[PDB]
Design a protein around this ligand. Structure first.
Ligand SMILES: COc1ccc(CC[C@@H](OC(=O)[C@@H]2CCCCN2C(=O)[C@H](c2cc(OC)c(OC)c(OC)c2)[C@@H]2C=CCCC2)c2cccc(OCCN3CCOCC3)c2)cc1OC
Length: 128
């Protein structure tokens, strides 16, 4: 399925080239600009632990998920992944534990050394 597809075909968007964050563009966005570090970003997302045990969606709260890019308010894989997106784009992001919650995890929600899958839509972005 989608997680197996991104695990084998996704573009490695990490700086170390360690395959820690893998990406596939599923819906091309509009405009050639991506957000800058510090920008406020608005997304919709559907996330799960790679093994189908826990799920979380911005849609569960009936509102877009808002955060400041590159500030460490979300896991590393999100700060790296959302920075590559254009407005209106939908991507699939596979995140290894080194760019997510690591060996410590985030109990009770996330176990030790967990891989996470996200389908993210970048709705909009604006400067500081
Ligand atoms: C710099 O490192 C970290 C920074 C932040 C965190 C906390 C977790 C972060 O969640 C995330 O970053 C990701 C990506 C964005 C959507 C939520 N995320 C999740 O993993 C989900 C998630 C949602 C959660 O709540 C809906 C969580 O509870 C707070 C949660 O706790 C670990 C994790 C999981 C996705 C897979 C299935 C289980 C749930 C999160 C969850 C919920 C809301 C968040 O809001 C961030 C933005 N605001 C901005 C305004 O000021 C407060 C922060 C962020 C851990 C960090 O590392 C240890």
């Amino acid at each position: 399925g989608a997680p197996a597809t991104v695990t084998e075909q996704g573009e490695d968007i990490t700086s170390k080239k360690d395959r820690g964050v893998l990406k596939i563009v599923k819906r091309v966005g509009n405009g050639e600009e991506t957000p800058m570090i510090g920008d406020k970003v608005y997304v919709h997302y559907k996330g799960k632990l790679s093994n189908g045990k826990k799920f979380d969606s911005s849609h569960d709260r009936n509102e877009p998920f808002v955060f400041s890019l590159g500030k460490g308010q979300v896991i590393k894989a999100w700060d790296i992944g959302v920075a590559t997106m254009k407005k209106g784009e939908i991507c699939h992001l596979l995140c290894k534990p080194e760019y997510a919650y690591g060996s410590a995890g985030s109990l009770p929600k996330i176990p030790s050394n967990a891989t996470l899958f996200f389908e993210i839509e970048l709705l909009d972005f604006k400067g500081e």
